[PDB]
Nucleic acid binder design. Structure first.
Ligand SMILES: [Mg+2]
Ligand SMILES: [Mg+2]
Ligand SMILES: [Mg+2]
Ligand SMILES: [Mg+2]
Ligand SMILES: [Mg+2]
Ligand SMILES: [Mg+2]
Ligand SMILES: [Mg+2]
Ligand SMILES: [Mg+2]
Ligand SMILES: [Mg+2]
Lengths: 37, 195, 132, 72, 520, 128, 304, 133, 101
RNA sequence: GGACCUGGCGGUGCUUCAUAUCCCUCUAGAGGAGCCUGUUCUGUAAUCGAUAAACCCCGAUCAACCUCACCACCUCUUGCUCAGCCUAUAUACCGCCAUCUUCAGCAAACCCUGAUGAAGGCUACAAAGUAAGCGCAAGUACCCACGUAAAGACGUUAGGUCAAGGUGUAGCCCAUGAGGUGGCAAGAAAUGGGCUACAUUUUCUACCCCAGAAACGAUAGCCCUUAUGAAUAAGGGUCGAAGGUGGAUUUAG
């Protein structure tokens, strides 16, 4: 289940051990989008 | 900042217990291995890459462990544990005389966490009717009942068992089936007498 | 013109490794497979599960040892035993290295209900096959 | 391939011979025909055990005893 | 357990300790994540179900006084037990079972300090039904967690109304007391308890220190143990060996115990006492005082588990190698070069002095290189020792190359660390021999190194000899611009220059000779 | 999903669009360029939402010669850490994008009065 | 340069370690033993030897490179250094000197092998002119040193047998002399035993050819070997076959009969049969079908 | 110099019942690398020799499974790319082999398997007639 | 966190067909049987018709796991052709080479 | 505007060639009739994309219901998603391929000539070119060393694909998102690729090859049976025509 997989990886990123590059990318672009409107 | 100590190549002597330094299956570990064995397609007037960065030796399966000396040692160790085969049983005719009923099962083994696989259940067995039936009426009855389970060229009656998932279920069901089959071939019927 | 697991020829400013250099049609002729299992052979099964789980393992370990690796991994599954082999750099401290080793070992073992173990080989700088 | 999962010490005859579980119908009707074919298929099936087979036949009992209206 | 590559290779005891502790911390982190999110690993993908791999469940169920009481002994804590006692005494006022009350008291005594005082004063409200088990467990708790007068009062109460219960009671009574000890032993042997000798072990632990008037009676008490035929002589024997501790070694008793432990080693061992870990360490501590090599070999199937803690293993190996060094030493260095990677300053000092007394000069370089490879850096005690011992020598002419090499490596290590300020006083102490060895092929290096030394001094007689030999070993100006400067610096170089200037130095130029005359 | 996620360099290539249709012919684009940025090098491995104290990588393993234990970074502590990281990222971005002042020679946007500095050293060794 | 000696001594130490681990004395030891040990201790599914794991001696691993051609300071050693191709031109100079000396008195070597014998590249043109100089040298009489110089470069012709194998006769009960042979085909494989003393009938899988081959061209092919040799009714044969195609089995039986008869018949007639061309396995096989093609060779209709 | 004094051996008990007699143990190794299969075969045959039992060897043929995939993504039917898995068989028969010998040998070999290989046992044991017959 | 809503629907259908598998099997046997009453066949057919939607094992599709591509998927590996070619070229999985025969 | 460098182009000259490619040549076919399956077009409320060479049994190694992305109707608003979108942009892209390629050149780094211009660098009985590296090649796979596969770079076609998947930009974020019922998926027509036969080398019968009869053709339609499914495919009876070997042109070897 992608449920288990993605939930595990999200919780572990919140722990701060798995440096998810794709998640970093998405977060930075979301930040820039909400900054520029 | 910190520097890694040099490998065990210069440390290891020519006289060394390789079966002891590599007891079980393990990767190449070039830092511990002293051999300069290289593997990799060289460039024009080039050479294969050194063992330190040669991860292809790790890619390939590993057999540095289990040297011939190690094999000899383990066989000499387990010689006292393994047993001996009876000298009287030294031929196929003799062994099939002593124990006519042949029976054989099988199963695979594959890499992975799970181990169950339904093919574990199937089994087969064989017996020649040349010496076991001891009669003619029951023999004709049995050969009329069985359709393809026999072979008269080699003269063996073979039967398989897979109806049950458990190996011992298959085994004892085959045994009970053979027993009831013999007991029902023993007797006869009036419509069987009329042919 | 085919583009499949190959490097674009540059001026000579691209360090490439053995695997990243050689072509995929050279895989059996001049390379080995990153995984070693029997699900692909005839009669076996769970090959899809093997591939999915090993891809997930590769991703998870690449991201839990980030910035230290310099090449693909070597998986070696002997029956029940699972063996991993990695090549890394001496960026961080051996404290961190062993801590993450134990962490990943425990996670993989509890996740797959399988005996897992791994080896890591240190390199000062990533080996290069050529400069393309 | 069977270290554990011994099927609760079940037996080949408990799997195959369902005449002990066939009690509440004679040996001529179409219900008998259907249930005999059911027992046949179940004995041929190794994947499921005596528990599953008795659950099958019990659900069948419930079914046709709730649809006892016809008996034709 | 440690990896194979050289970078991850733990090359020192403290760092290896920290490393496997980090691994254990990762194991605990794994436990935490699994018991915090069980549902993720709930899938039993593996065909064989394994509770060792299943997630762990310390979750109290719904309010149910009976099932909650049954779950008390499953949860292994004290707040649940407080709440259950509350629910059973305040509103219910009934006991689910005397066995449940006994188990609650067991847990609360094991968990125990004002908190212990409260936990012990909240057990007297328990229903009248308090049998021996309850009383003696209360005694256990009050002994192993609180003072001893309470345990004594509880024992008197029980008398008014077990092996390790009476063991704890004897511990409480003991912890000079001749009549006490005697009457205790007498009535204990009189009762039909027939202890497992753990009472004897505990009274020995309490007798850890005493004079002969209880050290020697321990021998007859042990003979009685043997007569009854119970003890394997695993812990009490070792404790009396330790009690033997000492103004004068007792060679007779030493030989006796040697034979005893010799037959103990000859026979096979089985563990019964949790205190067999101090056995190893303190045994080797006594062995170090004894100083015997056949003894060390005797002290050397699966009996290697009793070492355990890295601290005790360290003490053992240290004393072992120390005795082996201070015992030819070819077999000793063989054993050493065999166990160095497996094994982990004082040991190296003993090694250096052993090599000195042996006169095996060629071996010290490899040992220093191994120590440096492992963890020998940022400390110059052993550097000073090796330098002094190696340049007390000059007898190998060809080995002067190795002298120069190891000296260069030592200086490369010495000059690493400015920020720490520790490298400033290292040359003042050990630069003399280093520069002598550098002089003994390459000479310009030693020349400029003595320059740096004197321009940092603490002159020395062997420093004067070094200067003299260097000057005499062709170039008047090159020798003068050093010897004359050091003479103008200090007086002994000047009294040496008085003779140096005779051969060819004073004829060159008189300004430096004039400076020498002025300083003289 | 996580299986759909992948490495960083692929995403950077797809976002930058360095080649394929627009870079070739010299047509390029209207002076819009996305600047490469490295995120993995920036933050320490331990940083996350739940600020558990990690003696292995985030905290020194030993303190006062005493082994450490897992602990919690509470709300205002993790908020301070997040503010520090925001300030650090803003500082890195400021240092990243700045002016470039090549001395004005004969005219702006002209390479007339520009000097490249002395020649490079020779192979055999020749300083100019 | 010191890396060479480093690798050499380290390779010797590794060879001693290899002998120790495999478990024989290091006194006697060989490179075939090296390669067997490497193949056993580290197998590899790689097809190319250059890619497979190989523990080789460094002198043969590293290609020889020219050392420093000039001293630490000043002039170079060889007297053509200020031009390239110094070795080639010095050799050509010596050759021309020998030519003019012989004048006043009065197989070949491959380009790549020559370039590797030297350490200098070259061109096909200068290679050709060097071969021409050698031919000009050999047109005239030349002495022992000159012949040795020429044979230093010349290599073995390495000629092939150009001969047909003769199978050994065999003897069975009855004192029956005979000879067995085997033939193959596209998908058919057969074995035929020829009895010389017997003659007349022929059996195929236990059935005569007259009814085993309803078609007559198969029997014509079966007769073609005997007809060419002209021994028709003086030899009998039996044969077993396993194949799919009729003509396939026919050709297989023909080849087997010929490969069995070449033993009995003299070498002259064996040569005559070889010239006839019936003693070679047919290399022609149905080509593979390609994914984009409707067949092995045909393309889809060009739609434009 | 560190050589143990007394090597502790495991306990062994001879049960009163008789051991089973395996008529023939036929093992089949399916692999990808002929060299790995040859190494494994040498290993097994040397082990069987040193244990003192019979053995025969033969190399069954190579089996292959291949399949075609679309080379490109959207629209290319004629341009395909092919793939194939090659499985290589190696069979080994052991004759007249006691039950305990079978257990110890199979345990050893199964622990000393390589990775990319699958192992198939066919056990053939004889037995006399039952008592009901 | 499935890849998309169609994957969500597919998994829902899979679980529904599973949890109604044996029931559908029993009633389908009772329908397709021949000697039993035709009125009983019609009863069982009406029962199947009244059964809920998304319970039949034919509405499911053997879709891909990685990219959610329904077409071009192997039943053995369950992976799309594109991702399979990718992994085989990068050498991720074991024992596949190019068919240069 | 005068004169030049490079490339393209020449219904531009000379020479050497064209391997199944140009032809003359050899063979079998496509445009005749029917059927299957795509494309164009008509209408429907009813996807989408490529749609010359280099698409047209193409995405698809599958669409009765999911596959469904279309449409009508009916519902959800933090909505499995620390949301989602098959919405636009292939003229932002990655990833993956067609193309010349059934080629062999591409080229960092140096030098030289041209008055130090764009640019060029070939003469072997040799006159300024030297070349990293890539590619070709070699070796590897099948049965060989040949052959077939595989490989086949730099780059053109802003070539195809935001609909394998992700992603930059711009939008919906009570929706341009999501869920469940239903149908949509026909042909007055044109075109394409394949199958069938138009014959007697044919058709039927046992065998697959020494025989005996006739003097053919339905994989379309109607009815029925069976296969799985909860709800097209194979088989049987009847119908027994068009069809008489192709209207220019053209394909493959
Ligand atoms: Mg301006
Ligand atoms: Mg292609
Ligand atoms: Mg549909
Ligand atoms: Mg939509
Ligand atoms: Mg485009
Ligand atoms: Mg080629
Ligand atoms: Mg091709
Ligand atoms: Mg376009
Ligand atoms: Mg149906």
């Amino acid at each position: 289940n992608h449920h288990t997989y993605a939930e595990l990886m999200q919780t572990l990123r919140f722990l701060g051990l798995y440096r998810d590059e794709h998640q970093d990318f998405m977060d930075e672009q979301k930040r820039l989008k909400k900054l520029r409107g | 900042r910190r520097k890694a100590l040099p490998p065990r190549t210069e440390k290891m002597a020519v006289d060394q217990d390789w079966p002891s330094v590599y007891p079980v299956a393990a990767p190449f570990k070039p830092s511990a291995v002293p051999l300069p064995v290289r593997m990799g397609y060289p460039v024009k007037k080039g050479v294969p890459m050194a063992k330190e960065g040669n991860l292809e030796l790790l890619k390939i399966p590993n057999f540095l462990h289990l040297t011939p000396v190690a094999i000899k040692k383990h066989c000499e160790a387990l010689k006292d544990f393994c047993t001996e085969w009876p000298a009287a049983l030294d031929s196929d005719e003799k062994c099939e005389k002593h124990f006519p009923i042949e029976i054989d099962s099988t199963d695979y083994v594959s890499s992975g966490p799970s181990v169950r696989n339904p093919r574990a259940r199937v089994v087969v067995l064989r017996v020649k009717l040349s010496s076991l039936n001891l009669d003619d009426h029951a023999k004709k009855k049995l050969i009329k009942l069985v359709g393809e389970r026999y072979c008269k060229t080699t003269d063996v009656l073979t039967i398989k068992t897979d109806r049950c998932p458990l190996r011992r279920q298959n085994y004892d069901y085959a045994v009970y089936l053979l027993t009831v089959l013999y007991h029902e071939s023993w007797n006869t019927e009036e419509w069987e007498k009329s042919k | 013109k085919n583009r499949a697991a190959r490097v674009r020829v540059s001026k000579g400013d691209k360090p490439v490794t053995y695997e990243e250099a050689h072509a995929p049609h050279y895989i059996a002729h001049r390379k080995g497979w990153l995984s070693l299992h029997t699900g692909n052979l005839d009669g076996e099964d769970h090959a899809a599960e093997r591939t999915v789980e090993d891809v997930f393992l590769r991703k998870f370990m690449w991201g839990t040892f980030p910035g230290c690796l310099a090449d693909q991994l070597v998986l070696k599954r002997r029956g029940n035993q699972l063996e991993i082999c990695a090549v890394v750099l001496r960026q961080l401290s051996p404290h961190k290295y062993y801590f993450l080793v134990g962490y990943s070992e425990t996670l993989l073992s509890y996740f797959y209900k399988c005996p897992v173990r791994l080896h890591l080989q240190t390199v000062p700088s990533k080996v290069v096959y050529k400069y393309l | 391939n069977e270290a554990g999962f011994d099927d609760d010490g079940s037996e080949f005859h408990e799997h195959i011979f369902l005449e002990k579980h066939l009690e509440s119908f004679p040996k001529q009707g179409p219900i008998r025909h259907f249930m005999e074919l059911v027992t046949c298929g179940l004995s041929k099936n190794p994947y499921l055990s005596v528990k599953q087979k008795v659950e099958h036949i019990e659900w069948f009992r419930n079914y046709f005893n709730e649809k006892k209206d016809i008996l034709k | 357990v440690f990896q194979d590559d050289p970078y991850l290779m733990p090359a020192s005891s403290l760092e290896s300790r920290s490393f496997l502790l980090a691994k254990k911390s990762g194991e605990n982190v794994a436990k935490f994540i699994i018991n915090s999110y069980p549902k993720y690993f709930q899938k039993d993908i593996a065909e064989p179900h394994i509770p060792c791999l299943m997630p762990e469940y310390f979750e109290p169920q719904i309010k149910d006084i009976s099932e909650a009481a049954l779950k008390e002994r499953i949860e292994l804590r004290k707040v649940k037990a407080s709440v259950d006692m509350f629910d059973q005494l305040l509103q219910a006022g009934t006991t689910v079972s005397l066995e449940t009350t006994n188990s609650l008291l067991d847990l609360l005594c094991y968990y125990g300090t004002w908190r212990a005082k409260n936990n012990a004063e909240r057990i007297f409200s328990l229903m009248p039904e308090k049998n021996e088990h309850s009383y003696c467990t209360m005694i256990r708790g009050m002994v192993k967690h609180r003072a001893y007068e309470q345990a004594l009062n509880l024992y008197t109460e029980l008398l008014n109304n077990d092996v390790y219960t009476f063991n704890a009671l004897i511990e409480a009574t003991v912890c000079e007391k001749w009549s006490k000890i005697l009457e205790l032993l007498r009535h204990m042997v009189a009762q039909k308890v027939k202890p497992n000798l753990q009472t004897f072990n505990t009274i020995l632990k309490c007798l850890r220190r005493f004079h002969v008037f209880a050290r020697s009676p321990a021998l007859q008490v042990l003979r009685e143990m043997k007569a009854i035929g119970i003890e394997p002589s695993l812990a009490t024997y070792h404790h009396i060996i330790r009690l033997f501790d000492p103004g004068d070694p007792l060679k007779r008793s030493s030989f006796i115990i040697y034979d005893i432990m010799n037959e103990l080693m000859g026979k096979r061992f089985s563990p019964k006492d949790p205190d067999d870990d101090k056995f190893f360490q303190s045994a080797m501590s006594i062995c170090s005082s004894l100083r015997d090599l056949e003894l060390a070999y005797q002290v050397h199937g699966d009996n290697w588990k009793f070492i355990g803690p890295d601290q005790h293993r360290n003490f053992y190996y240290s004393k072992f190698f120390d005795l082996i060094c201070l015992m030819q030493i070819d077999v000793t260095l063989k054993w050493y070069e065999d166990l160095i990677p497996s094994a982990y300053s004082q040991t190296m000092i003993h090694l250096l002095q052993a090599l000195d007394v042996a006169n095996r000069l060629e071996v010290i370089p490899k040992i220093w290189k191994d120590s440096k490879e492992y963890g020998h850096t940022f400390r110059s005690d052993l550097r000073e020792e090796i330098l002094m011992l190696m340049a007390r020598d000059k007898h190998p002419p060809e080995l002067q190359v190795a002298f120069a090499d190891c000296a260069a490596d030592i200086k490369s290590a010495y000059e690493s660390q400015p920020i720490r300020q520790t490298a400033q006083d290292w040359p003042a102490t050990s630069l003399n021999c280093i520069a002598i060895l550098f002089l003994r092929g390459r000479t310009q290096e030693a020349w400029k190194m003595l320059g740096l030394f004197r321009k940092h001094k603490i002159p020395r007689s062997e420093l004067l000899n070094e200067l003299m030999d260097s000057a005499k070993v062709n170039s008047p100006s090159q020798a003068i611009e050093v010897v004359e400067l050091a003479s103008a610096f200090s007086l002994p170089i000047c009294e040496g220059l008085t003779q140096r200037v005779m051969s060819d130095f004073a004829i060159n130029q008189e300004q430096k000779e004039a400076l020498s005359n002025l300083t003289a | 999903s996580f299986f759909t996620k992948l490495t960083a360099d692929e995403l950077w290539k797809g976002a930058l669009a360095e080649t394929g249709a627009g870079a070739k012919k010299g047509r390029g684009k209207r002076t819009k360029k996305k600047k490469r940025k490295d995120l993995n090098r920036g933050q320490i491995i331990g940083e996350g939402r739940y600020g558990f104290l990690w003696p292995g990588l985030n905290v020194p393993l030993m303190k006062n010669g005493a082994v450490q234990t897992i602990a919690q970074r509470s709300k205002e502590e993790q908020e301070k850490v997040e503010a520090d990281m925001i300030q650090q990222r803003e500082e890195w971005d400021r240092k990243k994008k700045m002016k470039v002042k090549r001395e004005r020679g004969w005219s702006g946007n002209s390479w007339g009065g520009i000097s490249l500095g002395p020649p490079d050293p020779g192979p055999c060794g020749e300083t100019y | 340069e010191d890396f060479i000696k480093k690798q050499i001594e380290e390779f010797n130490i590794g060879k001693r370690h290899l002998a120790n681990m495999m478990g024989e004395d290091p006194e006697t030891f060989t490179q075939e033993d090296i390669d067997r040990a490497i193949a056993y201790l580290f197998p590899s599914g790689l097809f190319e030897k250059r890619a497979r794991p190989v523990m080789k001696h460094p002198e043969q691993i590293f290609p020889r490179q020219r050392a420093i051609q000039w001293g630490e300071d000043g002039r170079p050693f060889h007297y053509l250094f200020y031009t390239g191709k110094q070795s080639y031109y010095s050799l050509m100079h010596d050759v021309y000197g020998m030519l003019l000396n012989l004048e006043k008195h009065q197989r070949w070597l491959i380009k790549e092998e020559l370039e590797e014998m030297l350490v200098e590249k070259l061109s096909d043109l200068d290679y050709m002119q060097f071969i021409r100089l050698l031919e000009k040298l050999l047109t005239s009489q030349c002495g022992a040193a000159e012949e040795e110089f020429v044979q230093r470069f010349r290599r073995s012709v390495t000629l092939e047998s150009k001969k047909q194998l003769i199978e050994p006769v065999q003897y069975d009960e009855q004192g029956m002399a005979f000879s067995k042979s085997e033939g193959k085909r596209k998908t058919a494989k057969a074995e035929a035993i020829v009895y010389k003393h017997g003659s007349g009938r022929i059996k195929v899988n236990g059935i005569d050819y007259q009814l085993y081959f309803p078609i007559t061209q198969d029997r014509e092919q079966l007769m073609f070997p005997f007809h060419f040799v002209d021994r028709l009714g003086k030899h009998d044969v039996t044969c077993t076959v396993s194949g799919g195609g009729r003509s396939a089995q026919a050709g297989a039986i023909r080849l087997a009969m010929a490969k069995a008869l070449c033993s009995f018949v003299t070498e002259d007639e064996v040569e005559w049969m070889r010239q006839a061309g019936l003693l070679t396995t047919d290399p022609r096989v149905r080509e593979r079908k390609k994914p984009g093609q409707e067949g092995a060779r045909r393309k889809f209709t060009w739609k434009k | 110099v560190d050589v143990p004094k007394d090597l502790t051996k495991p306990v062994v008990t001879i049960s009163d019942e008789p051991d089973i007699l395996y008529k023939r143990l036929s093992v089949l190794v399916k692999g990808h690398d002929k060299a790995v299969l040859d190494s494994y075969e040498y290993f097994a045959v040397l082990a069987a020799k040193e244990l003192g039992i019979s053995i025969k060897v033969h190399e069954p043929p190579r089996k292959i499974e291949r399949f075609t995939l679309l080379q490109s993504v959207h629209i290319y039917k004629k341009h395909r790319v092919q793939y194939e898995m090659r499985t290589l068989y190696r069979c080994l028969e052991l004759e007249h082999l006691t039950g305990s010998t079978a257990d110890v040998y199979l345990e050893y070999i199964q622990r000393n398997l390589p990775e990319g290989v699958a192992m198939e046992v066919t056990k053939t044991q004889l037995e006399q007639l039952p008592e009901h017959i | 966190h499935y890849v998309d809503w169609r994957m969500w629907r597919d998994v829902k259908r899979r679980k529904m067909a599973y949890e109604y598998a044996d029931e559908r099997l029993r009633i389908n046997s009772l329908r397709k049987n021949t000697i039993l009453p035709k009125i009983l066949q019609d009863v069982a057919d009406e029962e199947i018709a009244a059964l809920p939607r998304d319970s039949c094992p034919v509405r499911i599709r053997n879709r891909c796991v990685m990219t959610s591509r329904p077409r071009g998927v192997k039943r053995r590996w369950r992976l799309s052709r594109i991702v399979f070619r990718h992994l085989a070229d990068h050498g991720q999985l074991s024992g596949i080479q190019r068919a240069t025969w």
